[PDB]
């Protein structure tokens, strides 16, 4: 499971099993990567133009 072969999680206390769907994420945060890279560069570039 940790090798991304089988998808699921077990239960040690009661000896049970739980359901885990195959996709863990859609495409959302990939757009935030473009925002973090912009605010860590263009923002620092603004002071170079002012100073």
């Amino acid at each position: 499971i940790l090798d991304k072969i089988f998808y699921g999680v077990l239960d040690q206390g009661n000896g049970w099993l739980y359901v885990y769907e195959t996709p863990n994420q859609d495409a959302t945060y990939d757009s935030a990567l473009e925002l973090v890279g912009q605010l860590n560069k263009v923002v620092d570039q603004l002071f170079e133009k002012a100073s």
Partner: protein, 255 residues
């Protein structure tokens, strides 16, 4: 099913015969549409009027010349060969008893199901100044086909040269329930169920969306995630322009 496509050339042509003939409310200008009814898309590329006379005292009295009907349809074949008799159009806001008796005239020379069109010069209420209906029997049964308008390239562009949202959508949506409420009350006292059965089918089909309400709010947040990122991009240009505006002011002080 089939759909009715009315070109802007036909809609504007029917409005001209009304003013030139000085037609009052006592008369209704009748005309003949021309097009191809064979396929599912019914397009009308030509229209012309006819010397029609209306009598309000007797609905069975109408004056129509069949000689001008066949002659003009034959003489206009030289322009385009795709123009045949698919039906006819007439004026007036309402359908009187004289309109039902004139439906069987053009059916002799018409192969497929004829098409009826009602031109309204006033255009009072909602949309669709021109409504299209089909005449078919099993008792006359009329069905309203979807009315669309599509023209050629030079015809659609020529309109833009002569002319050189959310609030309106909510106003007409509210009036739909007010007009439907009056139709049910008037029909209730008229009988004292078949007509109301069709309206009940649409009216019945957070009531049913309660199961999807939880999943709807989760999708609205993802939409705001994109809007929040685009808003920050627009905010960076404001600071960039503010610094850029100072560079112009710095040149004015030295020079």
């Amino acid at each position: 099913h089939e759909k009715v496509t009315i070109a802007p050339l036909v809609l504007l042509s029917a409005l001209d015969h009304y003013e030139r003939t000085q037609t009052k409310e006592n008369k209704r200008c009748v005309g003949v549409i021309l097009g191809d009814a064979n396929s599912s898309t019914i397009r009308v590329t030509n229209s012309f009027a006819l010397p029609f006379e209306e009598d309000e005292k007797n609905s069975d009295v109408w004056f129509l010349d069949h000689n001008y009907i066949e002659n003009m349809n034959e003489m206009c074949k030289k322009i385009n060969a795709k123009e045949k008799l698919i039906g006819w159009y007439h004026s007036g806001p309402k359908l009187r008893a004289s309109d039902l008796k004139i439906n069987e005239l053009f059916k002799k020379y018409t192969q497929n199901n004829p098409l009826l069109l009602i031109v309204d010069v006033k255009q009072q209420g909602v949309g669709l100044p021109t409504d299209a209906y089909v005449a078919i029997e099993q008792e006359k049964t009329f069905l309203h086909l979807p009315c669309t308008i599509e023209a050629e390239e030079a015809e659609e562009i020529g309109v833009e040269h002569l002319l050189r949202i959310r609030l309106t959508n909510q106003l007409k949506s509210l009036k739909g329930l007010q007009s439907k409420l009056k139709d049910v009350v008037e029909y209730l006292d008229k009988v004292i169920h078949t007509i109301l059965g069709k309206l009940q089918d649409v009216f019945n089909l957070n009531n049913l969306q309660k199961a999807l309400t939880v999943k709807t709010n989760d999708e609205l947040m993802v939409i705001y995630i994109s809007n929040l990122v685009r808003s920050i991009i627009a905010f960076d240009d404001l600071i960039e322009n503010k610094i850029q505006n100072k560079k112009i002011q710095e040149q004015r002080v030295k020079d």
